[PDB]
Amino acid sequence: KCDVYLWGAGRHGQLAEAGRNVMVPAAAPSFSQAQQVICGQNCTFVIQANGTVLACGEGSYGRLGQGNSDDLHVLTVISALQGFVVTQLVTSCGSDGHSMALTESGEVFSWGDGDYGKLGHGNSDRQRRPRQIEALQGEEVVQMSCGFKHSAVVTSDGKLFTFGNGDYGRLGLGNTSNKKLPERVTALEGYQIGQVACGLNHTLAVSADGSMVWAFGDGDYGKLGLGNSTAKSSPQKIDVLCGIGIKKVACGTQFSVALTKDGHVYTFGQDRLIGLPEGRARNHNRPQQIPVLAGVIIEDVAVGAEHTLALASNGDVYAWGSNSEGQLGLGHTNHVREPTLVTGLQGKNVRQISAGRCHSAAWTA
Ligand SMILES: [Cl-]
Ligand SMILES: [Cl-]
Ligand SMILES: [Cl-]
Ligand SMILES: [Mg+2]
Numbered sequence: 001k002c003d004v005y006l007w008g009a010g011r012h013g014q015l016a017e018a019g020r021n022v023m024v025p026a027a028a029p030s031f032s033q034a035q036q037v038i039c040g041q042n043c044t045f046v047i048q049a050n051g052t053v054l055a056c057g058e059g060s061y062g063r064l065g066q067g068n069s070d071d072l073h074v075l076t077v078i079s080a081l082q083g084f085v086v087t088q089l090v091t092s093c094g095s096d097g098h099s100m101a102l103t104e105s106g107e108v109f110s111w112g113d114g115d116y117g118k119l120g121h122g123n124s125d126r127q128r129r130p131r132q133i134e135a136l137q138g139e140e141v142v143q144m145s146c147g148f149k150h151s152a153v154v155t156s157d158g159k160l161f162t163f164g165n166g167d168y169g170r171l172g173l174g175n176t177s178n179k180k181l182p183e184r185v186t187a188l189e190g191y192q193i194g195q196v197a198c199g200l201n202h203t204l205a206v207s208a209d210g211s212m213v214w215a216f217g218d219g220d221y222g223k224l225g226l227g228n229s230t231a232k233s234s235p236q237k238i239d240v241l242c243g244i245g246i247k248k249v250a251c252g253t254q255f256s257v258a259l260t261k262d263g264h265v266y267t268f269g270q271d272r273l274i275g276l277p278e279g280r281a282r283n284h285n286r287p288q289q290i291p292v293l294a295g296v297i298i299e300d301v302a303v304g305a306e307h308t309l310a311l312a313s314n315g316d317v318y319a320w321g322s323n324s325e326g327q328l329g330l331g332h333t334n335h336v337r338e339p340t341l342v343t344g345l346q347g348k349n350v351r352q353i354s355a356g357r358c359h360s361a362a363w364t365a
Contacts, residue, residue, distance in 0.1 A: 001032040001033065002032060002034060002035075002363055002364040002365040003027065003032070003348065003349075003363060003364045004027070004028045004031035004032065004034055004037060004361065004362075004363040004364075005018075005025035005026060005027060005028065005344075005345065005348065005350075005361065005362050005363065006018040006022065006025070006026060006028045006031070006037075006044070006359065006360070006361050007022040007023065007024060007025045007026055007326060007327070007329040007344075007359065007360055007361075008022060008325050008326050008327035008329070008356070008358050008359030008360050009021065009042065009325035009326070009327070009357075009358040009359050010022055010359065011042075012042045012043070012057045012058035012071050013056055013057055013058075013071060013072060013073030013074070014039075014042050014043050014044045014056060014057030014058065014356075014359055015028065015044070015359060016028055016030050016031070016044075016056055016073060016074055016075060017029065017030055021325070021326065022326060022359075023326035023329070023330070023331050023332060023333065024326075024329055024330075024331050024344045025329045025342065025344040025345050025348075025362065030074065030075055031046060031075065031363070033046070033048050033049075034046040034047070034048065034363060034365060035047055035048060035049040035365050036088075036089070036352070036354075036365070037352075037354050037361045037363055038089050038090070038091055038354055039091075039304070039354045039355055039356030039357075039359050039360060039361050040057075040063070040091030040092065040093060040097065040099065040356050040357065041058065041063070041091070041092055041093055041094060041095075041096075041097040041356065041357045042057050042058035042356075042357060042358075042359075043055060043056065043057030043058050043059075043063050043064060043091065043097070043356075044056055044057050044075075044356070044359070044361070045089050045091065045099070046075055047086055047087075047088075047089055050085070051084065051085030051086050051087070051103075051104070052077060052081075052082070052086070053065075053077070053078045053081050053086050053089060053101060054075040054076055054077050054078065055072065055075065055076060055078055056072045056073060056074055056075050056076060057071070057072065058071055058097075059071045059072060060096065060097065061096045061097055061112055061113040061126055062111055062112050062113070062126050062127060062128030062129070063097045063098075063099070063111075063112050063113075064076070064078070065078045065080060065081070065099065065111045065112075065128070065129055065130050066078065066079075066080075066128070066129070067079075067080065067128045067129045068128060069128065078129075078130065080129035080130045081101060081109065081130050084103045084104075084107075084109075085103060085104045086101045086102065086103060087102055087103065087104055088101070088102040088143070088144065089101045089102070090144045090145055090146045091112075091146055091356075092112075092146040092147060092148055093148070093252075093304050093305040093355075093356055093357045094148040094200060094253070094305055094357055095113070095115075095148040095149050096112070096113035096115065097112045097113055098110065098111065098112030098113050098114075098118055098119060098146055098151070099111055099112050099130075099146065100133075100144045100146055100151060100153075101130060102141055102142075102144060105140075106139065106140030106141050106142065106155075106156065107132055107133075107136070107137075107141070108120075108132070108133045108136050108141050108144065108153060109130035109131060109132050109133070110127065110130065110131060110133055110151070111127045111128065111129055111130045111131060112126075112127065113126060114126045114127060115149070115165075116149050116150070116164045116165035116178050116180075117163055117164055117165075117178055117179055117180025117181070118146075118147075118149055118150055118151050118163060118164030118165065119131070119133070119151075120133040120135060120136070120151065120163045120164075120180070120181060120182050121133065121134070121180070121181075122135070122180050122181050123180060124180060133182065135181050135182050136153065136161070136182055139153075139155050139159075139161075140155055140156040140157070141153045141154070141155055141156075142154055142155065142156045143194070143195050143196065144196075145196050145197050145198040145203075145251075146198060147164070147170065147198030147199055147200065147201070147203065147251070148199070148200045148201065149164055149165035149167075149201070150162060150163065150164030150165050150166075150170050150171060150198055150203070151163055151164050151198065152196040152198050152203060153182065153196070154193050154194065154195055154196050154205075157192075158191070158192030158193050158194065158208050159184060159185075159188075159189070159193065160172075160184070160185040160188050160193040160196055160205055161182035161183060161184055161185065162179070162182070162183055162185055162203070163179045163180065163181060163182045163183060164178065164179065165178055165201075166178045166179060167201065167218075168201050168202075168217055168218035168219075168231045168233075169216050169217050169218070169231050169232050169233030169234070170198075170201050170202055170203055170216065170217035170218065171183065171185075171203075171216075172185045172187060172188075172203060172205075172214075172216040172217075172233070172234060172235050173185065173186075173233070173234075174187070174233050174234050175233060176233060185205075185235065187234050187235050188205065188214065188235055191207050191212065192207060192208040192209070193205050193206070193207060193208065194206050194207055194208035194209070194210070195248065195249065197249045197250045197251045197256075197303075198251055199217070199223070199251030199252055199253060199254075199255075199256070200218075200251075200252075200253040200254065200305075201217050201218040202215060202216065202217030202218050202219075202223055202224060202251060202256070203215070203216055203217050203251070204238075204249045204250075204251055204256055204258075205235060205249075206246050206248070206249050210245045210246045210247060210261060211242060211243060211245070211246075212237065212241075212242050213237070213238045213241040213242060213246055213249060213258065214235035214236060214237055214238065215232065215235070215236055215238055215256070216232045216233065216234060216235045216236060217231065217232070218231045219231045219232065220254060220270075221254045221255065221269045221270040221271075221284065221285075222268060222269060222284050222285020222286070223251075223254055223255050223256050223268060223269030223270070224236065224238075224256075225238045225240065225241070225256060225268040225269075225285065225286055225287045226238065226285070226286075227285050227286050228285060229285065238287060240266070240286055240287040241258055241266065241287055244260055245260055245261040245262065246258055246259070246260060246261070247259045247260060247261045248300070248301065250301055250302070250303035250308075251303060252269070252273060252303045252304065252305060252306055252307075252308070252321075253270075253273075253305050253306055254269050254270035254273060254306075255267060255268065255269025255270050255273045255274050256268050256269050256287075257301050257303055257308060258287060259298060259300070259301050262297075263296070263297035263298045263299070263313065264289055264290075264293070264294075264298070265289070265290045265293055265298050265301060265310060266287040266288060266289055266290070267287070267288065267290060267308075268284060268285060268286060268287045268288065269284065269285075270284070271284050272321075272322075272335065272337065273306055273307075273308075273321045273322070274288075275290050275292075275308065275320045275321070275337070275338055275339050276288060276290060276291070276337075276338070277291060277292075277337075277338065278337070290338075290339060292338050292339050293310065293318065293339055296310075296312045296316075296318075297312060297313040297314075298310050298311065298312055298313075299311050299312065299313050300352070300353060301353075302353040302354050302355040302360075303355055304321075304327060304355030304356050304357060304358065304359075304360065305322070305356075305357045305358065306321050306322035307319065307320065307321035307322050307323065307327050307328060307355060307358075307360070308320055308321050308339075308355065309342075309353045309354075309355050309360060309362070310339060310353075311350065311351075311352070311353050311362075315345075315348070315349050315350045315351065316341060316342075316345070316346065316350075317329075317341075317342040317345045317350055317353060317362055318339040318340060318341060318342065319336065319339065319340055319342050319360075320336045320337065320338055320339045320340060321335075321336065322335060322358075323335055323336055324358070325358040325359065327355070327356075327358045327359055327360050328340070328342070328360075329342045329344055329345070329360060330342060330343075331344075342362075345362055348362070348364065349364050350362040350363065350364060351363070351364055351365060352364075352365060
């Protein structure tokens with residue numbers, strides 16, 4: 001067992017017994033068998049240590065993978081993945097919602113809203129239960145991301161595939177067509193891609209050795225980190241992030257986050273969401289280190305739609321950004337510009353975090 005804390009919006013039952021509108025982290029005893037918790041678009045998934053997946057919250061457009069679209073207020077097993085050991089799960093933080101789960105054998109199952117081909121089945125049909133993406137048969141997928149209207153997967157041999165809505169270049173294929181089947185990002189074929197993150201309408205990718213980062217998609221608010229606000233349909237190196245050793249990247253609606261291996265956080269994009277003091281908004285269109293976290297070793301970051309959580313090596317959790325539903329966990333619903341300590345998690349020995357559209361989670365597994 002572990003301890004799980006949930007907070008933010010809970011009106012569709014996505015926080016189960018923790019409540020309906022929660023401004024401070026609240027214990028969720030029913031989640032105690034979680035090894036992972038994944039917060040999405042008004043929904044929450046759990047992966048148990050044995051590979052079983054459960055879901056609760058908003059069920060619109062098959063979100064919960066139950067074979068129907070019912071809202072659920074208690075964690076409920078996704079029977080359609082029974083038989084498979086699920087190791088990872090990702091879900092979108094906006095639009096009409098979709099999800100991808102990864103098995104032990106490197107196979108990817110997708111479900112939810114089918115618009116734009118983002119599920120990868122060669123059509124745009126809703127899938128109310130998890131369905132294997134057959135086109136990835138024989139690929140060993142190791143990492144995945146769900147954007148608002150597109151998706152992406154990374155393979156063990158370092159290839160990157162994208163699919164879904166093509167508007168503004170977000171698939172990185174050099175045009176803006178929608179793709180209903182996974183497409184190799186040929187521009188990156190000469191490199192080994194280790195991870196991908198997808199936002200409202202841009203995408204970031206990191207090389208396997210952490211030495212290189214690329215951006216593509218819509219350019220608003222300088223969220224591509226290339227020093228302007230122009231959309232790019234092919235991957236473009238983010239020079240500031242190359243050579244510094246990147247552990248992880250993540251994307252929100254109008255901003256990007258990068259974590260270095262030595263525990264520093266860089267942000268870029270819309271000023272209100274990037275956690276910097278106001279003077280530093282000058283260069284919001286290039287990556288900048290977050291000053292208030294300089295004396296903190298950050299082990300992980302989790303990005304929702306418009307908020308960010310950061311976990312320090314001592315277990316402390318920091319939050320900043322939008323907060324109208326209490327998703328920061330700070331006891332109010334006011335916007336917070338810079339990373340702020342979540343005091344409700346002090347002494348809780350948090351080891352993992354997750355951020356959804358407008359709810360959050362932290363737990364001790
Ligand atoms: Cl399996
Ligand atoms: Cl290929
Ligand atoms: Cl490096
Ligand atoms: Mg634009």
